[PDB]
Amino acid sequence: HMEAQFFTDTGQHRDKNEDAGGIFYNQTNQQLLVLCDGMGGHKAGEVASKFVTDELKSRFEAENLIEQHQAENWLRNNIKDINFQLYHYAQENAEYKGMGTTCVCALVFEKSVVIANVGDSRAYVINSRQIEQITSDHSFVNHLVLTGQITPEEAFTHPQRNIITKVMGTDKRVSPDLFIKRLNFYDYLLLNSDGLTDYVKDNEIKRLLVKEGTIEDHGDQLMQLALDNHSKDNVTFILAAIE
Numbered sequence: 001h002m003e004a005q006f007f008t009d010t011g012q013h014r015d016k017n018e019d020a021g022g023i024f025y026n027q028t029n030q031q032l033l034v035l036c037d038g039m040g041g042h043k044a045g046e047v048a049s050k051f052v053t054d055e056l057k058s059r060f061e062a063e064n065l066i067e068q069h070q071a072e073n074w075l076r077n078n079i080k081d082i083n084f085q086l087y088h089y090a091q092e093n094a095e096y097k098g099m100g101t102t103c104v105c106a107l108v109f110e111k112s113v114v115i116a117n118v119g120d121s122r123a124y125v126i127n128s129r130q131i132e133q134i135t136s137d138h139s140f141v142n143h144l145v146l147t148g149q150i151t152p153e154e155a156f157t158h159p160q161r162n163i164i165t166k167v168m169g170t171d172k173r174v175s176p177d178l179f180i181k182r183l184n185f186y187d188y189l190l191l192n193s194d195g196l197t198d199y200v201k202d203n204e205i206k207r208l209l210v211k212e213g214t215i216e217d218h219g220d221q222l223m224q225l226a227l228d229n230h231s232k233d234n235v236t237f238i239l240a241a242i243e
């Protein structure tokens with residue numbers, strides 16, 4: 001397990017905190033990091049994000065041992081099952097119909113992490129020289145950037161810049177992206193909701209983390225930075241020190 005801490009803030013302009021997440025432990029004290037961004041533009045985003053977080057917590061705490069070679073399959077199969085359960089929960093309740101959430105999560109191992117991603121929450125590794133975004137945003141503007149219809153700078157001003165193209169809960173099927181990243185020579189793992197990186201640039205995160213300070217020091221500084229940049233969203237992240 002890593003030294004890790006969860007940080008969240010409703011922010012200024014939101015009725016609810018619809019982000020969710022946590023740091024969970026199974027029966028042999030292996031660590032799972034979870035972050036979910038419930039959709040603000042649909043009903044009941046906090047129900048969706050807390051549903052997925054609660055399911056991952058309960059499923060993981062029920063396990064004895066998931067070794068590294070088992071982890072991609074465990075994450076893929078549980079995300080698909082949770083997506084299925086969330087979809088039908090929303091379909092059975094008119095006040096929840098259409099709800100959904102992103103999810104980024106990470107199973108921690110000695111020298112590596114296994115990450116699953118659905119949506120436009122992110123995972124990064126950071127060291128003194130670089131910050132690498134491991135995940136790829138499932139967002140409509142990322143689609144527009146990859147098809148070369150807009151530049152990445154326009155994405156910050158585009159009228160549909162909040163639309164996401166893969167989400168938990170809105171269809172009975174989902175296909176998460178899985179990543180395996182070696183941790184050697186990195187200093188930090190960061191999982192975050194778009195409330196952070198829609199407003200704080202990658203080099204700003206790197207500059208903050210490369211200074212001395214504890215995980216709690218850095219996370220409070222990073223939250224204050226997102227707020228100083230006038231984030232209009234819930235802001236959530238897990239910061240973990242590699243080691």
Ligand SMILES: [Mg+2]
Binds near residue numbers: 016039042044045046
């Ligand atoms: Mg809402």
Ligand SMILES: [Mg+2]
Binds near residue numbers: 127128185186187
């Ligand atoms: Mg280093």
Ligand SMILES: [Mn+2]
Binds near residue numbers: 037038039045
């Ligand atoms: Mn949200």
Ligand SMILES: [Mn+2]
Binds near residue numbers: 120139161162194
């Ligand atoms: Mn977004």
Ligand SMILES: [Mn+2]
Binds near residue numbers: 037193194
């Ligand atoms: Mn958000």
Ligand SMILES: [Mn+2]
Binds near residue numbers: 212
């Ligand atoms: Mn530091």
